[PDB]
């Protein structure tokens, strides 16, 4: 799904989650001043 995706599999620790949660703040900014 768009806007902070969520799909747990068989390879997700308490760290992969921080990497997944700290990615939304980048994807959102990727539509602000900077554009991919």
UniProtKB/Swiss-Prot annotation:
Pfam families: Hormone_3 (PF00159)
PTMs per UniProt: The peptide YY form is cleaved at Pro-2 by the prolyl endopeptidase FAP (seprase) activity (in vitro) to generate peptide YY(3-36).
Phosphoserine: residues bearing it: 13
PROSITE patterns according to UniProt: PANCREATIC_HORMONE_1, PANCREATIC_HORMONE_2
Superkingdom of the source species: Eukaryota
Cellular localization per UniProt: Secreted
Annotated site, Cleavage, chain positions: 2-3
UniProt xrefs under InterPro entries: Pancreatic_hormone-like (IPR001955), Pancreatic_hormone-like_CS (IPR020392)
GO molecular function: hormone activity; neuropeptide Y receptor binding
Modification Tyrosine amide occurs at: 36
A single GO cellular-component term on record: extracellular region
Keywords, sorted A to Z: Amidation, Hormone, Phosphoprotein, Secreted
Membership in a protein family: Belongs to the NPY family.
Function: This gut peptide inhibits exocrine pancreatic secretion, has a vasoconstrictory action and inhibitis jejunal and colonic mobility.
Stated name of the protein: Peptide YY
């Amino acid at each position: 799904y768009p806007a902070k995706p969520e799909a747990p599999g068989e390879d997700a620790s308490a760290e992969e989650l921080s990497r997944y949660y700290a990615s939304l703040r980048h994807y959102l900014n990727l539509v602000t001043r900077q554009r991919y």
